[PDB]
Amino acid sequence: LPKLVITHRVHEEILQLLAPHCELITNQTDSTLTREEILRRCRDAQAMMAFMPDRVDADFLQACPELRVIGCALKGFDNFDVDACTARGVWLTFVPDLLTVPTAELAIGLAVGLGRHLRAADAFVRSGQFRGWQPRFYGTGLDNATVGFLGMGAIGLAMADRLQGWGATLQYHAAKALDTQTEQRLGLRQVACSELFASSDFILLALPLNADTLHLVNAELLALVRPGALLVNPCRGSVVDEAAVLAALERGQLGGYAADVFEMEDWARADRPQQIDPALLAHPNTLFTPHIGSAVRAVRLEIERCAAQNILQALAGERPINAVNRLPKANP
Amino acid sequence: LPKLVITHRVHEEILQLLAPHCELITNQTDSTLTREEILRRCRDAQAMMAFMPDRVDADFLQACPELRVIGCALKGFDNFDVDACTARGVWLTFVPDLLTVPTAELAIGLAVGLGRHLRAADAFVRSGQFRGWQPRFYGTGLDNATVGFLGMGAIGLAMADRLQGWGATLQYHAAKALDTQTEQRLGLRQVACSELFASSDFILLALPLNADTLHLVNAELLALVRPGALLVNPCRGSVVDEAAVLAALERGQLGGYAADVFEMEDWARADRPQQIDPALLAHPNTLFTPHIGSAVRAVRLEIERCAAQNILQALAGERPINAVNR
Ligand SMILES: NC(=O)c1ccc[n+]([C@@H]2O[C@H](COP(=O)([O-])OP(=O)(O)OC[C@H]3O[C@@H](n4cnc5c(N)ncnc54)[C@H](O)[C@@H]3O)[C@@H](O)[C@H]2O)c1
């Protein structure tokens, strides 16, 4: 009986898991519906499965008073007002682990593609003009490089594991230090944010988007980079000031920027750019992907399953395993 | 000062190291000059620093009787008649293996780029049409995949090393098998050529080119492949049959092909293709690189430096460290 709205397309097997417990109102197409259309569907929904284009604020919740649970098919719930969910007695749940590994893979791929001029290399061969080896496309590889992680959580760790054996010197700065056991095991040295940006050949971002991280990578910080340094962003766009990244690119201090994420995606920002600057889109020392960190079908299936288990738990009157927040529940 | 012709562009610092010992006739441009032109340059040269696009046969050597050293900024001598060099008392020089590692880095970059549709994804956002996350561009990860190496010398090992931590299942076929200790270390399962192609999600090539290896990856073998299998060629072009790969791509059994090397490059074969098929070139499930395996700045510098020192040693009258002959 309880209505559940699902804002984007999910695997058949997921609908089968839910269909006995809920009234599914699904978006089994390839499109992102309108803000006003999801509001209408959610108006008396007991439940919601949310995805990356979703944004949930106190305004949204006011118009949807039957909501008991919002199940997020994602890790970074920055576009979801958790306090306001709590104020309305709505569970919010996320997916803590399943997005990690394929995002870590993409990022290393970006680091390699960016450092080796893959976009133009490939464009060149595709132009038909290839005739053999030339003294051209000399790049930056991982061997002997200083690699710097900003952040050292799930993707931080999964990337460092993936770079064991690459002959790089690994260093990091994070809100919380890793125990000495993990540092020695992964070859990781802890350094300050300033030192990270001044010494690293590659700088890989692995931070969530919050108030302390908004525009953390800025002109002051980019002004510090060794000339030609490569910056890689698989996490959230507004951890970076995209305009200062452009400027470091044009002056040739920053060697390259790769990103899977963009400022324009951060819906909880009133003042978000409405687009990626065409000038960064067209800069040659770049490589981009459309938020496909977790775009592997087998993985997406499990992300959906995790979200569905959470939603179903919540509707069964239990505390969901991946609740980010806390509601009153009866004791023994 | 003995005269030295540098066949292609080097870093300023190789010039600076060499000027005080050699008259330098350089080619500080992007172009590889015609062999007529390199022959003109080398008529009375004492030394030559050669690169990948150079070929040296008896005929070349006949036209250059004052040549003492060929110092090569490369490692394979397919393009080089070694016995001609020695017959005419010319040192033929190689560099140590600085090339394997950056090539292995690129190879994994390619497998990831190919599996995750990097070219198409990049173009999509550069188009300015990106409106945030969509449930498409689904791709293939390495995690839980089976990756099969065809071959396992220096390149096979470099790549296997770099794939520890990636949670894939590793397997290989090679003429020269690995010792048990390393198989153990690397989680590497040894299989037959047929089983490798039948059970690999990614197949990464690590083979030399020779008679036994010519068109090894042919239609019969590709026909065994799992639907959507991803093939990566960073080793040599002519170990695969590009027509057979294209054909495999077009029917959709092979999910993708990435290469840094192409048949048109293999100048030993008389029957070699004259370019890369434009329909392969135009295929969406590809990813290509213009033989940039070792195109890392630090490495190219060290490569030229080793070439230079071999040349200097030969001239001052010593046996060069990396002499391939005598
Ligand atoms: N591209 C994608 O598709 C994709 C996929 C998954 C996650 N992400 C994003 O990447 C982010 C990180 O993912 P995760 O799974 O590793 O998250 P996580 O919560 O496991 O780790 C976050 C880490 O950042 C650190 N941190 C927080 N504030 C910091 C600060 N001010 N300075 C330095 N370090 C700080 C924390 O100590 C923690 O170690 C997610 O929050 C999400 O926003 C993107």
Side-chain angles (χ1 to χ4, degrees), chain A residues 52 74-78 94-100 102-104 106 149-157 159 173-178 193 205-210 212-213 216 233-236 239 260-261 289 291-295 300, chain B residues 116 133:
Chain A
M52 200 63 229
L74 45 75
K75 180 70 178 277
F77 49 83
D78 39 297
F94 71 146
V95 183
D97 298 316
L98 310 179
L99 286 80
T100 284
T103 304
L106 184 62
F149 301 95
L150 189 44
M152 183 53 48
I155 106 278
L157 289 167
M159 288 181 293
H173 182 252
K176 192 148 148 280
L178 297 179
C193 198
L205 269 16
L207 284 186
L209 181 56
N210 56 241
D212 288 301
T213 69
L216 190 159
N233 187 3
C235 64
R236 281 291 169 277
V239 171
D260 182 54
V261 287
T289 46
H291 203 125
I292 53 165
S294 77
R300 285 313 304 193
Chain B
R116 307 292 291 272
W133 180 91

Coordinates of all heavy atoms in Angstrom, one line a residue, chain A residues 52 74-78 94-100 102-104 106 149-157 159 173-178 193 205-210 212-213 216 233-236 239 260-261 289 291-295 300, chain B residues 116 133, ligand 1:
Chain A
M52 N 21.3 11.4 -7.7 CA 22.2 12.5 -7.8 C 21.5 13.9 -8.2 O 21.9 14.9 -7.7 CB 23.4 12.2 -8.6 CG 24.6 13.1 -8.4 SD 25.3 12.9 -6.5 CE 25.4 14.8 -6.2
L74 N 23.2 7.0 -3.2 CA 24.5 7.8 -3.4 C 25.2 7.9 -2.0 O 24.6 7.5 -1.0 CB 24.2 9.2 -3.9 CG 23.0 10.0 -3.3 CD1 23.4 10.5 -2.0 CD2 22.6 11.1 -4.3
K75 N 26.4 8.4 -2.1 CA 27.3 8.6 -0.9 C 27.2 10.1 -0.4 O 27.0 10.3 0.8 CB 28.7 8.2 -1.2 CG 29.8 8.4 -0.1 CD 29.5 7.4 1.1 CE 30.5 7.6 2.2 NZ 31.8 6.8 1.9
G76 N 27.4 11.0 -1.3 CA 27.5 12.4 -0.9 C 26.1 13.0 -0.9 O 25.6 13.3 -2.0
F77 N 25.5 13.1 0.2 CA 24.1 13.6 0.3 C 24.1 15.2 0.6 O 23.2 15.7 1.3 CB 23.3 12.8 1.3 CG 24.0 12.7 2.7 CD1 23.9 13.7 3.6 CD2 24.7 11.5 2.9 CE1 24.6 13.5 4.8 CE2 25.4 11.3 4.1 CZ 25.3 12.4 5.1
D78 N 25.1 15.9 0.1 CA 25.2 17.4 0.2 C 23.9 18.1 -0.3 O 23.7 19.2 0.2 CB 26.4 17.9 -0.5 CG 26.7 17.2 -1.8 OD1 27.0 16.0 -1.7 OD2 26.7 17.9 -2.8
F94 N 21.8 6.6 3.0 CA 22.7 6.7 1.9 C 23.3 5.3 1.6 O 22.9 4.3 2.2 CB 23.8 7.8 2.2 CG 24.8 7.5 3.2 CD1 26.1 7.9 3.1 CD2 24.5 6.7 4.4 CE1 27.1 7.7 4.1 CE2 25.4 6.5 5.3 CZ 26.7 6.9 5.2
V95 N 24.3 5.3 0.7 CA 25.1 4.1 0.4 C 26.5 4.3 0.6 O 27.2 5.0 -0.1 CB 24.9 3.8 -1.2 CG1 25.7 2.5 -1.5 CG2 23.5 3.7 -1.6
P96 N 27.1 3.7 1.7 CA 28.4 4.1 2.2 C 29.6 3.6 1.5 O 30.6 4.2 1.6 CB 28.3 3.6 3.7 CG 27.4 2.5 3.7 CD 26.4 2.8 2.7
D97 N 29.4 2.5 0.7 CA 30.6 1.8 0.3 C 30.5 1.5 -1.2 O 31.6 1.5 -1.9 CB 30.8 0.5 1.1 CG 31.1 0.8 2.5 OD1 31.9 1.7 2.8 OD2 30.5 0.0 3.4
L98 N 29.4 1.2 -1.8 CA 29.3 0.6 -3.2 C 29.8 1.6 -4.3 O 30.1 1.1 -5.4 CB 27.9 0.0 -3.4 CG 27.4 -1.0 -2.3 CD1 26.1 -1.5 -2.6 CD2 28.4 -2.1 -2.1
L99 N 29.9 2.9 -4.1 CA 30.3 3.8 -5.2 C 31.8 3.9 -5.2 O 32.3 4.4 -6.2 CB 29.6 5.2 -5.0 CG 28.1 5.4 -5.3 CD1 27.2 5.0 -4.1 CD2 27.9 6.9 -5.6
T100 N 32.4 3.4 -4.2 CA 33.8 3.7 -3.9 C 34.8 3.3 -5.0 O 35.5 4.1 -5.6 CB 34.2 3.2 -2.5 OG1 33.7 4.1 -1.5 CG2 35.8 3.2 -2.4
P102 N 34.5 1.8 -8.2 CA 34.6 2.2 -9.6 C 35.0 3.7 -9.8 O 35.4 4.1 -10.8 CB 33.2 1.9 -10.2 CG 32.3 2.0 -8.9 CD 33.2 1.4 -7.8
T103 N 34.7 4.5 -8.7 CA 35.1 5.9 -8.7 C 36.6 6.1 -8.6 O 37.2 6.8 -9.3 CB 34.4 6.7 -7.6 OG1 33.0 6.6 -7.7 CG2 34.8 8.2 -7.7
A104 N 37.2 5.3 -7.7 CA 38.7 5.2 -7.6 C 39.3 4.7 -8.9 O 40.4 5.3 -9.2 CB 39.0 4.2 -6.4
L106 N 38.1 5.2 -12.0 CA 37.9 6.3 -13.0 C 39.0 7.4 -12.8 O 39.6 7.8 -13.7 CB 36.5 6.9 -12.9 CG 36.2 8.0 -14.0 CD1 36.2 7.3 -15.3 CD2 34.8 8.6 -13.7
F149 N 47.0 13.1 -1.9 CA 45.5 12.9 -1.7 C 45.0 14.0 -0.8 O 45.6 14.3 0.2 CB 45.2 11.6 -1.1 CG 45.7 10.4 -1.9 CD1 46.9 9.8 -1.6 CD2 44.9 9.9 -3.0 CE1 47.4 8.7 -2.4 CE2 45.4 8.8 -3.7 CZ 46.7 8.2 -3.4
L150 N 44.0 14.7 -1.3 CA 43.3 15.6 -0.4 C 42.0 14.9 0.1 O 41.1 14.7 -0.7 CB 42.9 16.9 -1.1 CG 42.3 18.0 -0.1 CD1 43.2 18.1 1.2 CD2 42.2 19.3 -0.9
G151 N 42.0 14.5 1.4 CA 41.0 13.6 1.9 C 41.6 12.2 1.9 O 42.4 11.9 1.0
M152 N 41.2 11.3 2.8 CA 41.7 10.0 3.0 C 40.6 9.0 3.6 O 40.9 8.4 4.6 CB 43.0 10.0 3.8 CG 43.7 8.6 3.9 SD 44.1 7.6 2.3 CE 44.9 8.9 1.2
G153 N 39.5 9.0 3.0 CA 38.4 8.2 3.4 C 38.2 7.0 2.5 O 39.2 6.4 2.2
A154 N 37.0 6.7 2.1 CA 36.8 5.5 1.3 C 37.5 5.6 -0.1 O 38.3 4.6 -0.4 CB 35.3 5.3 1.1
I155 N 37.3 6.6 -0.9 CA 37.9 6.7 -2.2 C 39.4 7.0 -2.1 O 40.2 6.4 -2.8 CB 37.2 7.5 -3.3 CG1 37.8 8.9 -3.6 CG2 35.6 7.5 -3.1 CD1 37.4 9.9 -2.7
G156 N 39.8 7.9 -1.1 CA 41.2 8.0 -0.8 C 41.9 6.7 -0.6 O 42.9 6.4 -1.4
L157 N 41.4 5.8 0.2 CA 42.0 4.5 0.5 C 42.0 3.6 -0.7 O 43.0 2.8 -0.9 CB 41.3 3.8 1.7 CG 41.6 4.5 3.1 CD1 40.7 4.0 4.2 CD2 43.1 4.4 3.5
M159 N 42.0 4.4 -3.8 CA 42.9 4.8 -4.8 C 44.4 4.5 -4.4 O 45.2 4.1 -5.3 CB 42.8 6.4 -5.1 CG 41.6 6.8 -5.8 SD 41.5 8.8 -6.1 CE 41.3 9.4 -4.2
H173 N 46.7 14.7 3.0 CA 46.2 15.5 4.1 C 44.7 15.2 4.2 O 44.0 15.0 3.2 CB 46.3 17.0 3.8 CG 45.8 17.9 4.9 ND1 44.7 18.6 4.9 CD2 46.4 18.1 6.1 CE1 44.5 19.2 6.0 NE2 45.5 18.9 6.8
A174 N 44.3 15.1 5.5 CA 42.9 14.7 5.8 C 42.4 15.3 7.1 O 43.3 15.7 7.9 CB 42.9 13.1 5.9
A175 N 41.1 15.4 7.3 CA 40.5 15.9 8.5 C 40.9 15.0 9.7 O 41.4 15.5 10.7 CB 39.0 16.0 8.4
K176 N 40.9 13.7 9.5 CA 41.4 12.7 10.5 C 42.6 11.8 9.9 O 42.5 11.2 8.9 CB 40.4 11.8 11.1 CG 40.9 10.9 12.3 CD 39.8 10.7 13.3 CE 40.0 9.3 13.9 NZ 39.5 8.2 13.1
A177 N 43.7 11.9 10.7 CA 44.9 11.0 10.5 C 44.6 9.6 10.4 O 43.6 9.1 11.1 CB 45.9 11.3 11.6
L178 N 45.3 8.8 9.6 CA 45.3 7.4 9.5 C 46.2 6.9 10.6 O 47.3 7.4 10.8 CB 45.8 6.8 8.2 CG 45.1 7.2 6.9 CD1 45.9 6.5 5.8 CD2 43.6 6.7 6.9
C193 N 47.9 20.7 4.2 CA 47.3 21.1 2.9 C 48.3 21.9 2.1 O 48.4 21.7 0.9 CB 46.0 21.8 3.2 SG 44.9 21.9 1.8
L205 N 41.6 14.7 -5.5 CA 40.7 15.1 -4.5 C 39.8 14.0 -4.0 O 39.3 13.2 -4.8 CB 39.8 16.2 -5.0 CG 40.2 17.7 -4.9 CD1 41.7 18.0 -4.5 CD2 39.9 18.4 -6.1
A206 N 39.6 13.8 -2.7 CA 38.8 12.8 -2.2 C 38.1 13.2 -1.0 O 38.2 12.6 0.1 CB 39.7 11.5 -1.9
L207 N 37.4 14.4 -1.1 CA 36.7 15.0 0.0 C 35.3 15.1 -0.3 O 34.9 15.2 -1.4 CB 37.2 16.5 0.1 CG 38.5 17.0 0.6 CD1 38.6 18.5 0.7 CD2 38.7 16.4 2.0
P208 N 34.4 15.1 0.8 CA 33.0 15.5 0.5 C 32.8 17.0 0.4 O 33.8 17.8 0.6 CB 32.3 15.0 1.8 CG 33.4 15.1 2.9 CD 34.7 15.1 2.2
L209 N 31.7 17.4 -0.1 CA 31.3 18.8 -0.2 C 30.6 19.3 1.1 O 29.4 18.9 1.3 CB 30.4 19.1 -1.4 CG 30.0 20.6 -1.6 CD1 31.2 21.6 -1.6 CD2 29.2 20.8 -2.8
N210 N 31.2 20.1 1.9 CA 30.5 20.7 3.0 C 30.9 22.2 3.1 O 31.7 22.6 2.3 CB 30.7 20.0 4.3 CG 32.2 19.9 4.7 OD1 32.7 18.7 4.8 ND2 32.9 21.0 4.8
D212 N 33.1 23.6 5.1 CA 34.5 23.7 5.2 C 35.2 23.4 4.0 O 36.4 23.7 3.8 CB 35.1 22.9 6.4 CG 34.8 23.4 7.7 OD1 35.2 24.5 8.0 OD2 34.1 22.6 8.5
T213 N 34.6 22.7 3.0 CA 35.3 22.3 1.8 C 34.9 23.1 0.6 O 35.6 23.0 -0.4 CB 35.1 20.7 1.6 OG1 33.8 20.4 1.2 CG2 35.6 20.0 2.8
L216 N 37.5 25.1 -1.3 CA 38.8 24.9 -0.6 C 40.0 24.9 -1.5 O 41.1 25.4 -1.1 CB 38.8 23.5 0.2 CG 39.9 23.1 1.2 CD1 39.3 22.1 2.1 CD2 41.1 22.6 0.5
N233 N 39.7 15.6 -10.0 CA 38.5 15.8 -9.1 C 37.4 14.7 -9.4 O 36.6 14.9 -10.3 CB 38.0 17.2 -9.2 CG 36.9 17.5 -8.2 OD1 36.6 16.6 -7.3 ND2 36.3 18.7 -8.2
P234 N 37.4 13.7 -8.6 CA 36.3 12.7 -8.7 C 35.2 12.9 -7.7 O 34.3 12.1 -7.6 CB 37.0 11.4 -8.5 CG 38.0 11.7 -7.4 CD 38.5 13.1 -7.8
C235 N 35.3 13.9 -6.8 CA 34.5 13.9 -5.7 C 33.2 14.8 -5.8 O 32.1 14.2 -6.0 CB 35.3 14.1 -4.4 SG 36.2 15.7 -4.2
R236 N 33.4 16.1 -5.7 CA 32.3 17.1 -5.9 C 32.9 18.4 -6.5 O 34.1 18.8 -6.2 CB 31.7 17.5 -4.5 CG 30.7 16.6 -3.9 CD 29.4 16.6 -4.7 NE 28.4 15.5 -4.3 CZ 28.5 14.2 -4.7 NH1 29.5 13.8 -5.5 NH2 27.6 13.3 -4.3
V239 N 34.2 21.7 -4.3 CA 35.4 21.6 -3.5 C 36.4 22.4 -4.2 O 37.4 22.9 -3.6 CB 35.9 20.1 -3.4 CG1 37.3 20.0 -2.8 CG2 34.9 19.3 -2.6
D260 N 35.2 14.6 -13.0 CA 34.0 13.8 -13.3 C 32.8 14.6 -12.7 O 31.7 14.1 -12.9 CB 34.1 12.5 -12.5 CG 33.0 11.6 -12.8 OD1 32.7 11.3 -14.0 OD2 32.3 11.1 -11.8
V261 N 33.1 15.7 -12.0 CA 32.0 16.4 -11.3 C 32.2 17.9 -11.5 O 33.3 18.4 -11.7 CB 32.0 16.1 -9.8 CG1 31.4 14.7 -9.6 CG2 33.4 16.2 -9.2
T289 N 34.5 13.7 -17.5 CA 33.5 12.7 -17.6 C 32.2 13.1 -17.0 O 32.3 13.9 -16.0 CB 34.0 11.3 -17.0 OG1 34.6 11.6 -15.7 CG2 35.0 10.7 -17.9
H291 N 30.0 12.7 -14.5 CA 29.6 12.0 -13.3 C 29.3 10.5 -13.5 O 28.2 10.1 -13.2 CB 28.4 12.7 -12.7 CG 28.2 12.6 -11.2 ND1 28.1 13.6 -10.3 CD2 28.2 11.4 -10.4 CE1 28.1 13.2 -9.1 NE2 28.1 11.8 -9.1
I292 N 30.3 9.8 -14.0 CA 30.1 8.4 -14.3 C 31.0 7.5 -13.3 O 31.3 6.4 -13.6 CB 30.5 8.1 -15.7 CG1 31.9 8.6 -16.1 CG2 29.4 8.5 -16.7 CD1 32.4 8.0 -17.4
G293 N 31.5 8.1 -12.2 CA 32.3 7.4 -11.2 C 31.7 6.1 -10.9 O 32.3 5.0 -10.9
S294 N 30.3 6.0 -10.7 CA 29.7 4.8 -10.3 C 28.9 4.1 -11.4 O 28.2 3.1 -11.2 CB 28.9 4.9 -9.0 OG 27.7 5.6 -9.2
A295 N 29.1 4.6 -12.7 CA 28.4 4.1 -13.9 C 28.9 2.7 -14.4 O 29.4 2.6 -15.5 CB 28.5 5.1 -15.0
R300 N 25.7 -0.4 -10.0 CA 24.4 0.4 -9.9 C 23.3 -0.4 -9.4 O 22.6 0.0 -8.5 CB 24.0 1.1 -11.3 CG 24.8 2.3 -11.7 CD 25.0 3.4 -10.6 NE 23.8 3.8 -10.0 CZ 23.6 4.9 -9.2 NH1 24.6 5.6 -8.9 NH2 22.4 5.2 -8.8
Chain B
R116 N 35.4 2.5 -19.8 CA 34.5 3.5 -19.2 C 34.1 4.6 -20.3 O 33.5 5.6 -19.9 CB 35.2 4.2 -18.0 CG 35.7 3.2 -16.9 CD 34.6 2.6 -16.2 NE 33.8 3.4 -15.3 CZ 34.0 3.7 -14.1 NH1 35.1 3.2 -13.5 NH2 33.2 4.5 -13.4
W133 N 23.9 14.4 -13.6 CA 24.0 12.9 -13.6 C 22.8 12.3 -14.4 O 21.7 12.6 -14.2 CB 24.0 12.4 -12.2 CG 24.0 10.9 -12.2 CD1 25.2 10.1 -12.1 CD2 22.9 9.9 -12.2 NE1 24.8 8.7 -12.1 CE2 23.5 8.6 -12.1 CE3 21.6 10.1 -12.3 CZ2 22.7 7.5 -12.1 CZ3 20.8 8.9 -12.3 CH2 21.3 7.6 -12.2
Ligands
LIG1 N1 32.2 10.9 -8.8 C1 31.3 10.1 -8.2 O1 30.5 9.5 -8.9 C2 31.4 9.9 -6.8 C3 31.2 8.7 -6.2 C4 31.3 8.5 -4.8 C5 31.6 9.6 -4.1 N2 31.7 10.9 -4.6 C6 32.0 12.0 -3.8 O2 33.3 11.9 -3.2 C7 33.2 12.2 -1.8 C8 34.2 11.4 -1.0 O3 33.8 10.0 -1.0 P1 34.3 9.0 0.1 O4 33.3 7.8 -0.2 O5 35.8 8.8 0.2 O6 33.7 9.7 1.4 P2 34.2 9.4 2.9 O7 33.2 10.1 3.8 O8 34.5 7.9 3.0 O9 35.6 10.2 3.1 C9 35.6 11.6 3.3 C10 37.0 12.0 3.8 O10 37.3 13.4 3.6 C11 37.9 13.9 4.9 N3 37.6 15.4 5.1 C12 36.5 16.0 5.4 N4 36.7 17.3 5.5 C13 38.0 17.5 5.2 C14 38.8 18.7 5.2 N5 38.2 19.9 5.4 N6 40.1 18.6 4.9 C15 40.6 17.4 4.6 N7 39.9 16.3 4.6 C16 38.6 16.3 5.0 C17 37.3 13.0 6.0 O11 38.1 13.0 7.1 C18 37.1 11.7 5.3 O12 38.3 10.9 5.5 C19 31.8 11.8 -1.4 O13 31.3 12.6 -0.3 C20 31.0 12.3 -2.6 O14 30.8 13.7 -2.4 C21 31.7 11.0 -5.9

